[PDB]
DNA sequence: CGATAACTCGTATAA
DNA sequence: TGTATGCTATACGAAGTTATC
DNA sequence: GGATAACTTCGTATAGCATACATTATACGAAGTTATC
DNA sequence: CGATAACTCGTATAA
DNA sequence: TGTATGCTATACGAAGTTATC
DNA sequence: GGATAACTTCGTATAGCATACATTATACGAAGTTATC
């Protein structure tokens, strides 16, 4: 069609309207839908309802996670709607098998995993264990954790903090100003305040590294084997790295992780996030207050992030034991 | 013509719904059809004008609002899954439905909920049944101890099975809740019996000896003698477990009226409702509660504790200062 | 047209799918529109932009309130859309004129009046002054006024309260149950609980009048010259009545409604709502707690119910004088 | 008024509609027409300079144009303003609007993102809090210059009532009444909305009254009740009452600028906005003072006329009373 | 009986 | 009274006015 | 005549909000209507 | 001059 | 990462069952 | 033999609760890169 090739053409020219992470996944599900589609002798676009339904099932057979099967059907979907042609999920065949796959796989004993938690308990420990270090590497990481725990920001949002983004409350606490996050991109921003405790842990790392040199510097940066922080203002620390700072401080206190190859065996990016999220509910904070700390818009999600207490647990058990 | 194809695919993957949905899908299609041949109307495809006369009918028969909607609901799905117009996209249907809802709620119809099986009740049922011996009066006190200690649905309480059970060095059981019923389980992946409730559950495990095979289901049938008949193929039915509540409630307040009101005696939910209500009384924050049960909206939990003294209101607090 | 005679029919057919006063007012408008339409030689249906406009213009001349003209324009649009036609407020002309008529009025001086407040301080007065009487109607009127300011319910709702609707908390506080209000209609409904002191003034009138001999008995009912009750289950006390009860009680203390033809010169239906709303505001109750105490689902209405403290006022004044 | 809805360009009924919108012009705010005209004017010149057709607008061009503004360095709220007016021009004349088409829509979304990442961020008024009133008051309360007396009256009334500046330049004497307590009370007719969410009267404190009464008896504005409360004052320190001409908003914004220039000195040399008090400084200030002294968000919002928490919060966001919950936990 | 306390209708305006 | 982005103010540098130094 | 305090007007850049939609309630003086007195 | 500390990319899966 | 509404699950009188009493 | 106790299985009437839609982000092992030891 003329129109379909213009709609598509329109999109690529403004591809940056979408998240780079969206492109990465569109191209991956695309080349993966193309491969199969070829080694089966089928047309890959516009996608025929029946052929996709098949594909989805091959993905079930491959033993892939539900949510991965989704994302695939999902990117095939955007690719179309954006082209202005009806989507695969617009046919009963795709629409249903998808639910089936979501049903079958659920009972086979499959649910969604979620990051190991990094709670206050753990903060106090790691803090007191590296509180007294004098090394740049440590001084930093003990500041990256306090922020992550206190502000509940995602790791990417943190890699982005620039020094000119920090200001102070009158009483002393710090204030980071966050602009773009996973679900809000505006000029009004939002101010996430650290505490007095963490404020000092950032402060120590600020001087000990020297980044307050150019306000346009990113607050966090590399520290090479020689122990010297190498500030910058064009390249930020990869998320892969902050992810690393987690794994490490757990391969510190508890060393070597399993040979299971299972996911979330040690701390990762979301840990502090789900961590504080727990400690709050447990401390009895209101629903709205938890929503602000997290940056969530509805009970629906806050509610998700809770899997809660276990050992003796809490709630009922604490109630039964008079 | 084409619809017949949609219909076959609609079936090819019948797996896409709960066995429990199909039941009502047929149960209603059955009823709709019955009404059609008796008044002279084609039951499929449905024509608004007709559906409307049918809906206004279920009102007369006295069926409650929330039901008329399940009828209408089901009808819709039947047409949508077939390239066809639902009946609710028609101007006449949606028009009467509003008529009916306002007419019924106005005529004084009301929605009810389970009778609450609070702690006060678990304590009074623990006594007279505590020092029993009968291989049943044991299984019953253990099932109840669980229903209140986990706000697990009666259906999940069936599927539980030995393997699933394990222990915490605290000395309290901890039922692994494998095979949830939602991809993202807002309820845990591990419920944990208290201290007493554990002990009470152990008793029934030895006596019944479901223990042997781990695939066996924790609870089971118990014949007129007083002996457990373990098994790992058939689970102790939903109906069964409901009755267990029905009994205990008959054993303390006699039997039901002559009337037909529902919730005249504890049923499956009784457990949760009580649990909820009590945590409220204590001081547990709504999120903790919402989580302990496994809830996601919040109205439903407020629905339960709406009549406590704490959740009275702000004007009250203002008048009593 | 042919269809339009159907749509209009279906409509009149299940006319019970709309409120009483919706239809009441719909006709009343077509009866003003049809009028002006005859005497001016203009078709009345389908209404032509210009015509509607000339009319909306007329009403502004006849001195009507913005809010009123808006009702006329509104009813006119329901009839057209509900019958399958484009709305007259769909034409660049009707809408711009409607927007103009407001702007001009507001910019002149017009503003929207609101019920005279019946604060917590008006309760206490009306109480020690009727608290001791033994009359059959002074006992009623004081419960109503109690349930009114205490529950915030709208009079039409109050009228509908049947005895089988009341239940009790263990603390012993009546707890009325409403199911149909201006904003929502369902089987779930909400449960307004009364204070202790006020649940008492009800436990009274229930007895003294004994409307409690048949459940399906409206908690509130007429009194007669002789001071005798008069229960029912097929006749609710008139809303027009409850509006009276307020005036009366206002007379009782402030004399006679001065003659100025103006509205809100003495207590009326909403006087309890605006009242309570304002007291809570002052007292310092939160937004989500006020919203709930009045059946509102959004900050922008609670806010709409306030035109706070006069004279020495509050806030800024209190703030500067301290 | 408009650019030049063409002899052959404005084709058909876009002429009908357009005529209509102009017939009922009083339907939009004066300040709205000002922008609409200003945007067409501005789009029109880029179209001449760049050789494009100015109306109806073609997407591919509106897009090239929005990417231009971005480059000129304009802000995102400014670019949406341009797109917005252009949209009305079209919709209010019958044609299908820009950003009703894939290209404009997408570009716009892209412009927004890019800009935020370059860390562009909104500024708000510099607060005129209560400790500023006090400092500014302990200084000009000893002056007898008639100007000063006027200004101090204004600053007082401004902080005390949280009224917009345009709203103040309309308060006319006949509007000032008295309270049994001896403190003025300003009725505020000619409000801003059918439903005046802020009130129908504002009461001045006892002290802010002493401050306004001394301007009233030195200017002589009482001579004619219809007179505006505030007015000019010339080279010679002499008042000049009127009932037809109100003081401009520009001038009130000037009283704020100068009152800041007085205490803190000449203004910094960059071109940044909000480097000295402006018309919103008091509303913003008062908002913070109320928060700091424990006042319910409803009570605050009504004091200002706000109706959307999202705003009065953007003022008191960096207060300590709002540091959040995770800070309360971490802090034993 | 007729005079009265105590209570359906249309238009205007707020929720 | 609840659900849908689009109108409507202020910011401020600079140029144009008008009565007093 | 000029120079100049103190404005008013302008025009473009940006912050701050406010209403259309689609019903559903109340306000209130006037008739109309029961059972008491 | 290696050896080593400390940091792109493709698929899978959560938010 | 959020939610109106479209699927899921319990309620329960009553009929079949299958081992004990 | 005949009468339960204790259950399964039904069908319809009602409560309860959670998803499709459209992006945007994190998990993590392997491979690559650059100062420094
Ligand atoms: Mg999907
Ligand atoms: Mg302007
Ligand atoms: Mg200051
Ligand atoms: Mg000045
Ligand atoms: Mg300053
Ligand atoms: Mg000058
Ligand atoms: Mg994949």
Q: What is the DSSP string of A2-46?
A: HHHHHHHHHHHTTGGGS-HHHHHHHHHHHHHHHHHHHTTT---SS
CA of residue D148 to ligand 4 center, whole Å: 8
DSSP result, A263-303: S-SS--TTHHHHHHHHHHHHHT--HHHHHHHHT-S-HHHHH
Q: Which residues of A touch B291 (CB under 8 A)?
A: 281, 303, 306, 308, 315
CA angle, corner A293, sides to A287 and A294, nearest 5?
A: 90
* Nucleotide nearest D123, from its CA to each C1': G15
Q: How is residue D180 written in tokens?
A: 């049994």
| Cα dihedral A84→A87→A90→A94 (10° resolution) | 170
In angstroms, rounded to a whole number, what is the distance separating the alpha carbons of residues B128 and B149?
19
C-alpha to C-alpha distance for A162 and A41, rounded to whole angstroms: 52
Is it true that the peptide bond before D322 is cis, omega within 30 degrees of 0?
no
DSSP state of B295: -
Distance, in Å, from the CA atom of A163 to the CA atom of C175, rounded to the nearest integer, reads 57
**In CATH, which of 3.40.47.10, 3.90.1170.50, 1.10.150.130, 1.10.10.10 is domain C1-111?**
1.10.150.130
Read off the tokens for D214.
């001394």
Residue D301 phi, psi dihedral angles, 5° rounding: -50, -40
Other Cβ atoms within 10 Å of D85 Cβ, number: 19
Q: How far apart are CA A15 and CA A9, in angstroms?
A: 10
E-state strands within chain A = 166-168, 174-180, 185-192
Give residue D235 CA to ligand 6 midpoint distance, Å.
Answer: 11
Does an interface of 3+ CB pairs under 8 Å exist between D and A? yes
Nucleotides of strand H under 7 angstroms from a protein beta carbon: 4-15
Nearest-angstrom CA–CA distance, D307 and A184: 22
At residue A223, the 3 state secondary structure works out as strand
Place of tokens 């001195």: C63
Q: How far apart are CA C142 and CA C125, in angstroms?
A: 11
Say if B96 is an interface residue toward chain A (CB within 8 Å).
no
Say if B303 is an interface residue toward chain C (CB within 8 Å).
yes
Give strand pairing partners of D201.
D187
In angstroms, rounded to a whole number, what is the distance separating the alpha carbons of residues A250 and A268?
Answer: 9
Residues of C within 8 A of B111 (CB-CB) are 186-189
B151 vs A96: CB contact, 8 Å cut-off? no
C-alpha D276 to ligand 5 mean position (Å): 7
Q: Is A318 helix (H, G, I), strand (E, B) or coil?
A: helix
Number of Cβ within a 10 Å radius of residue D59: 19
Residue B148 near residue B274, CB atoms below 8 Å: yes
The rounded Å distance from CA A71 to ligand 7 centre is 7
Question: Which residue do the tokens 């009545």 mark?
Answer: C241
Q: Phi and psi of B112, rounded to 5°?
A: -115, 175
- For residue B242, give the DSSP letter: H
DSSP A63: T
Q: Are C114 and C303 in contact (CB under 8 A)?
A: no
Longest dimension (CA), chain D: 75
Q: Burial of D202 by CB count in 10 Å (0-12 exposed, 13-18 middle, 19+ buried)?
A: buried
Three-state DSSP state, B145 = helix
Q: What is the largest CA-CA distance in chain A?
A: 74
Which ranges in B132-235 belong to alpha helices (H)? 135-150, 154-159, 196-208
CB contact under 8 A, C303 and D303: no
CA distances from C289 to A13, B94, B245, B311, C181 (A): 50, 35, 37, 11, 19
**β-pairing verdict for D176-178 and C185-190:** unpaired
Which candidate, C128, C134, C147, C113, places its Cα nearest to that of C245? C147
Q: Closest protein residue to F21 using CA and C1' atoms? A: D235
Question: The domain D123-322: what is its CATH number?
Answer: 1.10.443.10
Of B95, B102, B312, the CB nearest to C173: B312
Place of tokens 């345009």: D166
- Please state whether the peptide bond connecting residue B43 to the residue before it is cis, i.e. omega within 30 degrees of 0: no
Q: Which residues contact A253 (CB under 8 A, 6 or more apart)?
A: A125, A126, A129
Are the CB atoms for B185 and B176 separated by under 8 Å? Answer: no
Upstream peptide bond of B45 is cis (omega within 30 degrees of 0) = yes
Lookup: tokens for B23: 């039941």
Q: Note whether A147 and A268 are within 8 A (CB).
A: no
Chosen from B16, B178, B180 to mutate, greatest number of chain A CBs within 10 A: B16
Structure tokens at B201: 């559950």
Chains B–C, number of C-beta pairs less than 8 Å apart: 100
CA of D277, nearest ligand number: 5
| Residue numbers 64-123 of C with CB closer than 7 A to any atom of strand G | 70-71, 74-75, 77-78, 81-82, 87, 89-90, 95, 98-99, 102, 106, 115
- Distance, in Å, from the CA atom of D270 to the CA atom of D136, rounded to the nearest integer, reads 26
Eight-class DSSP state of B87 = S
Q: How far is B22 from chain C (nearest CA, A)?
A: 26
Residue B76 C-alpha to ligand 3 middle, in angstroms?
64
Q: Which fold has domain B112-311?
A: hpI Integrase; Chain A (1.10.443)
Cβ contacts of C100 within 8 Å, gap of 6 or more: D24, D26, D27
- CA distance linking residue C316 with residue D17, whole number of Å: 49
Which of B168, B195, B288 minimises the CB distance to A311?
Answer: B168
Query: Which nucleotides of strand I are protein-proximal, with an atom < 7 A from a CB?
Result: 1-3, 6-14, 19-21
Which residue is closest to C302 within chain D, CA to CA?
D298
Closest CA to B21 of B81, B91, B93: B81
Tell whether B307 lies on the interface with C, counting CB pairs under 8 A.
yes
Judged by its nearest atom, the ligand closest to the C-alpha of residue A89 is: 1
* Cβ-contact A306, A299 below 8 angstroms: no
Q: How many CB atoms lie within 10 A of CB C298?
A: 10
Q: Long-range pairs for D78-85 at CB < 8 Å and ≥24 separation?
A: D79/D108, D79/D111, D80/D108, D81/D35, D81/D39, D82/D39, D82/D42, D82/D43, D83/D108, D85/D35, D85/D36, D85/D39, D85/D40
User: Nearest CA to CA, how far is A37 from chain D (Å)?
Assistant: 29
Placement of tokens 């908002």 in the chain = D287
**A145: burial class by Cβ within 10 Å (0-12, 13-18, 19+)?**
buried
Burial class, B223, CB count within 10 angstroms (exposed 0-12 / middle 13-18 / buried 19+): exposed
The domain B1-110 is placed in CATH, from the list 3.40.50.620, 1.10.10.410, 1.10.1050.10, 1.10.150.130, at 1.10.150.130
Tell me the chain A residues in contact with residue B7 when contact means C-beta distances shorter than 8 Å: none
Tokens at residue A44, please? 């890959």
Instruction: Show the tokens assigned to D101.
Output: 């088409």
Which residue among A149, A169, A196 places its CB closest to the CB of D331? A196
The residues with which B176 forms a beta bridge, in sequence order, are B190
Q: The tokens of D281 are what?
A: 């400084």
Cβ of D250: how many Cβ atoms within 10 Å? 9
| Token reading at D261 | 């220039």
Catalytic residues of D: 164, 280, 283, 306, 315
∠ CA B268-B269-B271, rounded to 5°: 95
Which two structure tokens, joined as six digits, stand for C236?
């609710």
D191 touches strand G (CB under 7 A): no
Bases on strand J under 7 Å from any protein CB: 4-30, 35-37
Q: Which of A114, A112, A87, A89 is nearest to A99 (CA)?
A: A89
CA distance D203 to chain C (A): 6
| Rounded distance between C-alpha atoms, residue A138 and residue D143, angstroms | 61
Sign of the C-alpha dihedral, residues B271, B277, B281, B282?
A: positive
Q: Tokens 């007082």 belong to which residue?
A: D156
- Locate the domains of chain A by residue range: 1-111, 113-315
Find and list the nucleotides of strand F having atoms within 7 Å of a protein beta carbon.
1-3, 6-14, 19-21
Long-range contacts of residues A131-136, Cβ cutoff 8 Å, at least 24 apart: A135/A227, A136/A208, A136/A209, A136/A223, A136/A227, A136/A228, A136/A229
DSSP label of B14: G
User: What residues in C contact D297, CB-CB < 8 Å?
Assistant: 286-287
Total length of chain C: 322
- In this structure, the number of other CB atoms found within 10 A of the CB of residue B213 comes to 14
Q: Is the CB of D81 under 7 A from strand G?
A: yes
Cα distance between residue A20 and residue A18, in whole Å: 6
A113-315 in CATH: which number? 1.10.443.10
The CA–CA distances, whole Å, from D189 to B137, C148, D202, D302 equal 79, 32, 11, 17
CA angle centred on A99, ends A94 and A100, rounded to 5°: 95
The candidate with the shortest Cα–Cα distance to B123, out of B196, B173, B193, is B196
- Please indicate the experimental technique that yielded this structure: X-ray
Fold of C113-312: hpI Integrase; Chain A (1.10.443)
Query: Is B271 in contact with B148 (CB distance < 8 Å)?
Result: yes
From CA B195, how far away is CA C316, in angstroms rounded? 58
Query: What would the two tokens of residue A253 be?
Result: 């206190």
Bridge partners (DSSP) listed for residue D176: D186
The catalytically annotated residue of C149, C218, C267, C296 is: C296
State which CATH number among 3.30.200.20, 1.10.150.130, 1.10.8.60, 1.20.1250.20 fits the domain covering D11-121.
1.10.150.130
Which candidate, B205, C301, C124, A209, places its Cα nearest to that of D308? Answer: C301
Q: Write out the H or E segment, with its range, that includes residue A251.
A: helix A239-253
CA B253 – CA B265 distance, rounded (Å): 9
Which helix or strand (DSSP H or E) is residue A80 part of? helix A66-83
Beta bridge partners of C218: C162
Please indicate whether residue C240 is annotated as part of the active site. Answer: no
What are D207's two structure tokens? 């002290």
Q: How many CB atoms lie within 10 A of CB D252?
A: 23
In this structure, the protein residues whose CB atom falls closer than 7 angstroms to any atom of nucleic acid strand F are C 103, 182-183, 295-298, 300-301; D 28-32, 35, 81, 84, 87-88, 125, 164-167, 192, 234-236, 238, 249-250, 253, 257, 267, 271, 273-276, 278-281
DSSP state of B15: G
Cα(C52)–Cα(C89) distance, rounded to whole angstroms? 9
Bin C311: left if φ > 0, else alpha if -120 < ψ < 50, else beta.
left
Cis-peptide, bond into residue A46, ω within 30° of zero: yes
Can you tell me the distance from the alpha carbon of C13 to that of A148, in angstroms, rounded to the nearest whole number? 62
Nucleotide nearest to A183 (CA to C1'): I1
Pick from A305, A241, A264: nearest CA to A115:
A264
Q: What is the 3-state secondary structure (H, E, C) of chain C?
A: CCCHHHHHHHHHHCHHHCCHHHHHHHHHHHHHHHHHHHCCCCCCCCCCHHHHHHHHHHHHHCCCCHHHHHHHHHHHHHHHHHCCCCCHHHCHHHHHHHHHHHHHHHHHCCCCCCCCCCCHHHHHHHHCCCCCCCCHHHHHHHHHHHHHHHHCCCHHHHHHCEHHHCCECCCCCEECCEEECCCCEEEEEECCECCHHHHHHHHHHHHHHCCCCCCCCECCCCCCCCCCCCCCCCCCCCHHHHHHHHHHHHHHHHCCCCCCCCCCCCCCCCHHHHHHHHHHHHHCCCHHHHHHCCCCCCHHHHHHHCCCCCCCCCCHHHHHHC
CA of D274 to the centre of ligand 6 (A): 21
Of C96, C300, C307, the CB nearest to D20: C96
- In angstroms, this model's resolution equals 3.2
User: Rounded to 5 degrees, what are φ and ψ at B276?
Assistant: -40, -70
Chains that touch A (3 or more CB pairs under 8 A): B, D
- Beta-carbon contacts of C107 under 8 Å, excluding residues fewer than 6 positions away, are D190
Q: Which ligand is nearest to the CA of D256?
A: 4
Nucleotide nearest to A264 (CA to C1'): J27
Cβ–Cβ < 8 Å for C271, C115: yes
3-class secondary structure, A53: helix
Query: Across-strand partners of A167?
Result: A175
Tokens of D218: 């030195």
SS (H, E, C) chain D: CCCCCCCCCCCCCHHHHHHHHHHCHHHCCHHHHHHHHHHHHHHHHHHHHHCCCCCCCCHHHHHHHHHHHHHHCCCHHHHHHHHHHHHHHHHCCCCCCCCCCHHHHHHHHHHHHHHHHCCCCCCCCCCCCHHHHHHHHHHHCCCCCHHHHHHHHHHHHHHHHCCCHHHHCCCEHHHEEECCCCCEEEECCCCCCCCCCCCCEEECCHHHHHHHHHHHHHHCCCCCCCCECCCCECCCCCECCCCCCCCCHHHHHHHHHHHHHHHHCCCCCCCCCCCCCCCCHHHHHHHHHHHHCCCCHHHHHHHHCCCCCHHHHHHCCCCHHHCCHHHHHHCC
- The nucleotide lying nearest D81 (C-alpha to C1') is G14
Q: Which residue from C42, C81, C79, C78 is spatially nearest to C58, judged by alpha carbons?
A: C42
Half-sphere exposure of A66 (CA within 13 A, CB side): 20
Across the A/B interface, how many CB contacts are shorter than 8 Å?
126
Give CA angle at C199 (C198, C201), nearest 5°.
60
Residues 6 or more apart from C128 whose CB is under 8 A from it? none
- For an interface test with D, give the residue of A169, A214, A287 to mutate (most D CBs within 10 A): A169
Strand E reaches within 7 A of the C237 CB: yes
- Answer yes or no: are the C-beta atoms of D320 and A169 closer than 8 Å: yes
3-state secondary structure of B90: coil
For residues D268 and D258, give the distance between their C-alpha atoms in angstroms, rounded to a whole number: 14
Residue A127 and residue A1: Cα distance in Å, rounded? 62
Catalytic residues of B: 153, 269, 272, 295, 304
Please name every residue paired with D187 in a beta bridge, in sequence order, or none if there are none: D201
């Amino acid at each position: 069609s003329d129109e379909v090739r213009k709609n598509l053409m329109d999109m690529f020219r403004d591809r940056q309207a979408f998240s780079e992470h969206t492109w990465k996944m569109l191209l991956s599900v695309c080349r993966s839908w193309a491969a199969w589609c070829k080694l089966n002798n089928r047309k890959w676009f516009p996608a025929e309802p029946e052929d996709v339904r098949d594909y989805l099932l091959y993905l079930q057979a491959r033993g892939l996670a539900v949510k991965t099967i989704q994302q695939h059907l999902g990117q095939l979907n955007m690719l179309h709607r954006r082209s202005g042609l009806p989507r695969p999920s617009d046919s009963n065949a795709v629409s249903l098998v998808m639910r089936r796959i979501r049903k079958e796989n659920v009972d086979a004993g499959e649910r969604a995993k979620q990051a190991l938690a990094f709670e206050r308990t753990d903060f106090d420990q790691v803090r007191s264990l590296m509180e007294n270090s004098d090394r740049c590497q440590d001084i930093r990481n003990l500041a990256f954790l306090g922020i992550a725990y206190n502000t509940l920001l995602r790791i990417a949002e943190i890699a982005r903090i620039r020094v000119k983004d920090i200001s102070r409350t009158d009483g002393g606490r710090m204030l980071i100003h966050i602009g773009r996050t996973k679900t809000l991109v505006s000029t009004a921003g939002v101010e996430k305040a650290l505490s007095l405790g963490v404020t000092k842990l950032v402060e120590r790392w600020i001087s000990v590294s020297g980044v307050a040199d150019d306000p346009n510097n990113y607050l966090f940066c590399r520290v090479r084997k020689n122990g010297v922080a190498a500030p910058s203002a064009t390249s930020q620390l990869s998320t892969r790295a902050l992810e690393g700072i987690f794994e490490a401080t757990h391969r510190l206190i508890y060393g070597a992780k399993d040979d299971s190859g299972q996911r979330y065996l040690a701390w990762s990016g979301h840990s502090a996030r789900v961590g504080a999220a727990r400690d709050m509910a447990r401390a009895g904070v209101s629903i709205p207050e938890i929503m602000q700390a997290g940056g969530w818009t509805n009970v629906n999600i806050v509610m998700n992030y809770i899997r809660n207490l276990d050992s003796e647990t809490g709630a009922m058990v604490r109630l039964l034991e008079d």
